[PDB]
Design a protein around this ligand. Structure first.
Ligand code: CLA
Ligand code: CLA
Ligand SMILES: CCCCCCCCCCCCCCCCCC(=O)OC[C@H](CO[C@@H]1O[C@H](CO)[C@H](O)[C@H](O)[C@H]1O)OC(=O)CCCCCCCCCCCCCCCCC
Ligand code: HEM
Ligand SMILES: CC1=C(/C=C/C(C)=C/C=C/C(C)=C/C=C/C=C(C)/C=C/C=C(C)/C=C/C2=C(C)CCCC2(C)C)C(C)(C)CCC1
Ligand SMILES: [Ca+2]
Ligand SMILES: [Cl-]
Lengths: 97, 137, 56, 243, 56
């Protein structure tokens, strides 16, 4: 029984929040302070077993940690989807305006 | 419909103060925006980085906030990335980099205010078209 | 519009939603289908309408 | 020393560097030192495709094919960590580079076989106790083979995985079931295997060259058909460095 | 497969296609010009030349 994995993912938290394991990097522009500095660090250090693990990225400033804490409610994690992370698609997913 | 004093009334700062631009300032703002900015920012988008637009809601969530005259005027002197983290004058037109972006050389403080006012007034006129791109043409 | 009128009259008279819709003649519902609209064809799409969407 | 203008349009840009016949030395590995491959290059010279068994269910053979996509096949500028393991074996962990090429080869009779010729995420290891890299060293390992097309790719009827229609819109009232395999795009991810056989070593410069053979699946057209088994053979070059 | 002329080409030594296959099941053979296709083309050109001669 054949499934479109992207459509299916839209019915998970991936369709509701920024998925630190899958979502394209431009999504971090949605919230104050995340783009591009933290966005880059998050994508680079993915995947994460839980949202809070984002706080464990090396080199972070205290300011950066606090911004991350204030924005955990906007994050989720789901299993890595090959279709969303191949092709360097997390950095450029072929969508502009 | 008219370009009224209310349409021309935009936030001066983050502290609740507004400024009412004159019709001539609005015209100057359009002219100067076309002169210095529209090559990349036509219609409120950004051609060399479409992820970032000139929508008011977008400017509000920028760091420091850019949804007011002061924020925009400061951007034009000392532009930063969206999180305020790096200064990008070396790759983005500004007064600080008027040496490498020569069109910025003749821009006065008054000019910057006019450009800032254009950026804030235009979406009040154009709605979703401003920063919308081709979808809304 | 007629289908909706009939369903609303059924509901007003106390029928359930299932009953109201079950009272719609199949013949009437079939007219409310674009496959029977004569402006949906093609010049070289030959034969009966049944050859396209199938025998209803 | 050759410049871009010396090389442009000759075909040389698709060739890996070679070492001359005198390069039969040994490159010492200090197990206290960290190492990298600064440049790995793979130049395919032959693509073989396993014929689909007629139904006899004997041994289907790998047969020759004709390259139709020109001198666009080599993997190069690849870099990664060269770990020294506790048993003295070396493990290459591919990090980055031009580590894939779409390639189309053509079988006798015309069937075209596109593949993503690749060493993406290569992890290759030598035999234990390699105190020096010599003409007796070999590397064996596996790599990832992602879908030949990525998720935005749209078929000629506008259907795709991350974009596109989800149905055959030109057949508005066709029964969907028979078309499910074409309508529902799937993204393949499989494993490949590669052997690197060192034939030449410059002990002084850290440069090695040899022959390789890799095995991987070809394109499956986003799940529309079965992939073929491909065997790629060619030459390689690598520069080892302390790092 | 209902092949009628193919066996006559094969009988006298034409066994391969320009496309790379041979009727004995080989792959990657080069038949040269005189593949089944080359034979067919030669006959078509001959036909044309004989047609012109007939007109003369
Ligand atoms: C008023 C004329 C007329 C009309 C409106 C119909 C209508 C119909 N017929 Mg009937 N039919 C007719 C006359 C007509 N018929 C005649 C004269 C015959 C004997 C040939 C038939 C025999 C017939 C059969 C056997 C069948 C039908 C069927 C049908 C249905 C399908 C029609 C179709 O697929 O057309 C397709 C129409 C076209 C593809 C358009 C043709 C356009 C021509 C080729 C243009 C020619 C251009 C010209 C050469 C240009 C010259 C240029 C020059 C001046 C420079 C439809 C209800 C089918 C049906 O469903 O039966 C139950 C069916 O099986 N018809
Ligand atoms: C120009 C030279 C030439 C060559 C090299 C070929 C070559 C070929 N042809 Mg083509 N062909 C040609 C010209 C040629 N043809 C011409 C001019 C025609 C039009 C008539 C044709 C029409 C043709 C057809 C219809 C076919 C071929 C076919 C073939 C293939 C099989 C040949 C075969 O089995 O012969 C068999 C020939 C004989 C058995 C000859 C019999 C000789 C009789 C018995 C002679 C009796 C009279 C004699 C005077 C008696 C005294 C003899 C004396 C020594 C004692 C082969 C690729 C076959 C094919 O594969 O097509 C794709 C096929 O079906 N050819
Ligand atoms: C004397 C000799 C006469 C010989 C007749 C010459 C035959 C030539 C072919 C004629 C071309 C028409 C072929 C249509 C394609 C086809 O196969 O149809 C085949 C169709 C039948 O359609 C078939 O139906 C079957 C079940 O009955 C199945 O569904 C088949 O799938 C379906 O193809 O035949 C017709 O419908 C013929 C009637 C068409 C009448 C349409 C009226 C419009 C004509 C006005 C145009 C005037 C233009 C003037 C311009 C100047
Ligand atoms: C004086 C004229 C200009 C003005 C007033 C202006 C204004 C702005 C503003 C306010 C932003 C921030 C957007 C946001 O926070 O949502 C921005 C970003 C940007 N602009 Fe301009 N701009 C001008 C000229 C240009 C030109 C000519 C270019 C192209 C060469 C350009 C390219 C960019 C880019 C690439 C960004 C994103 C930068 C980043 O955050 O990394 N701008 N601009
Ligand atoms: C040797 C050889 C061979 C063979 C060959 C052949 C077989 C040939 C032939 C040939 C031919 C078979 C030829 C021919 C021809 C011809 C011609 C040359 C013609 C012509 C013509 C004309 C000129 C005409 C004209 C006209 C017209 C068109 C119309 C009307 C009028 C007129 C009459 C004027 C082969 C391949 C085996 C191989 C190797 C060698
Ligand atoms: Ca060897
Ligand atoms: Cl947006």
């Amino acid at each position: 029984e054949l499934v479109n994995v992207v459509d299916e993912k839209l019915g998970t938290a991936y369709g509701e929040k920024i998925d630190l394991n899958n979502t394209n990097i431009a999504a971090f522009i949605q919230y104050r302070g995340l783009y591009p500095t933290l966005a880059k660090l998050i994508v680079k250090n993915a995947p994460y077993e839980s949202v809070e693990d984002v706080l464990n990225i090396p080199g972070l400033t205290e300011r950066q940690k606090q911004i991350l804490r204030e924005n955990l409610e906007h994050f989720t994690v789901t299993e890595v989807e090959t279709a969303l992370v191949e092709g360097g698609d997390r950095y450029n997913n072929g969508l502009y305006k | 419909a008219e370009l009224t004093p209310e349409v021309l009334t935009v936030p001066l700062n983050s502290e609740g103060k507004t400024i009412t631009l004159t019709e001539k300032q609005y015209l100057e703002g359009k002219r100067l925006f076309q002169y210095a900015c529209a090559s990349c920012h036509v219609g409120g988008i950004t051609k060399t980085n479409p992820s970032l637009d000139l929508r008011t809601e977008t400017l509000a969530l920028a760091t420091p906030p850019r949804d007011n005259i002061e924020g925009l005027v400061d951007y034009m002197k000392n532009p930063t990335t969206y999180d305020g983290e790096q200064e990008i004058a070396e790759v983005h037109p500004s007064l600080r980099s008027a040496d490498i972006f020569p069109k910025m050389r003749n821009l006065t403080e008054k000019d910057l205010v006019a450009i800032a006012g254009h950026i804030l007034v235009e979406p009040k006129i154009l709605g979703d078209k401003w920063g919308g791109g081709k979808v809304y043409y | 519009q007629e289908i909706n009128r009939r369903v609303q009259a059924s509901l007003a008279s106390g029928a359930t939603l299932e009953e109201a819709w079950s009272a719609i003649p199949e013949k009437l519902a079939f007219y409310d289908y674009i496959g029977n609209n004569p402006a949906k064809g093609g010049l070289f799409r030959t034969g009966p309408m049944n050859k396209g969407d199938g025998i209803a | 020393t050759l410049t871009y203008d010396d090389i442009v349009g000759t075909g040389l840009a698709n060739k890996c560097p070679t070492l001359d016949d005198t390069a039969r030395g040994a490159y010492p590995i200090d197990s206290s030192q960290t190492y990298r491959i600064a440049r790995l290059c793979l130049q395919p010279t032959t693509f073989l495709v396993k014929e689909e068994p007629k139904n006899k269910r004997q041994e289907a053979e790998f047969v020759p094919t004709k390259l139709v996509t020109r001198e666009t096949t080599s993997l190069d500028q690849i870099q990664g960590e060269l770990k020294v393991n506790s048993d003295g074996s070396l493990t290459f962990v591919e990090e980055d580079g031009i580590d894939f090429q779409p390639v189309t080869v053509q079988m006798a009779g015309g069937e075209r076989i596109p593949l993503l010729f690749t060493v993406k995420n290569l992890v290759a290891s030598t035999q234990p106790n390699v105190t020096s890299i010599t003409t007796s060293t070999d590397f064996k390992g596996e790599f990832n083979v992602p879908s030949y097309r990525t998720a935005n790719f749209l078929d000629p009827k506008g259907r795709g995985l991350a974009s596109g229609y989800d149905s055959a819109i030109a057949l508005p009232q066709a029964k969907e079931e028979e078309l499910a395999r074409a309508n529902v795009k799937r993204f393949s991810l499989t494993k490949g295997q590669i052997s690197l056989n060192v034939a030449k070593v410059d002990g002084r410069t850290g440069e090695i060259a040899g022959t390789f053979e890799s095995e991987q699946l070809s394109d499956d057209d986003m799940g529309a058909h079965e992939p073929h088994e491909v065997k790629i053979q060619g030459v390689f070059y690598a520069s080892i460095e302390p790092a | 497969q209902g092949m009628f002329v193919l066996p006559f080409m094969a009988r006298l030594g034409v066994t391969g296609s320009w496309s790379g296959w041979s009727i004995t099941g080989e792959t990657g053979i080069d038949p040269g010009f005189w593949s089944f296709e080359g034979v067919a083309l030669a006959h078509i050109v001959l036909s044309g030349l004989l047609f012109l001669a007939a007109c003369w």
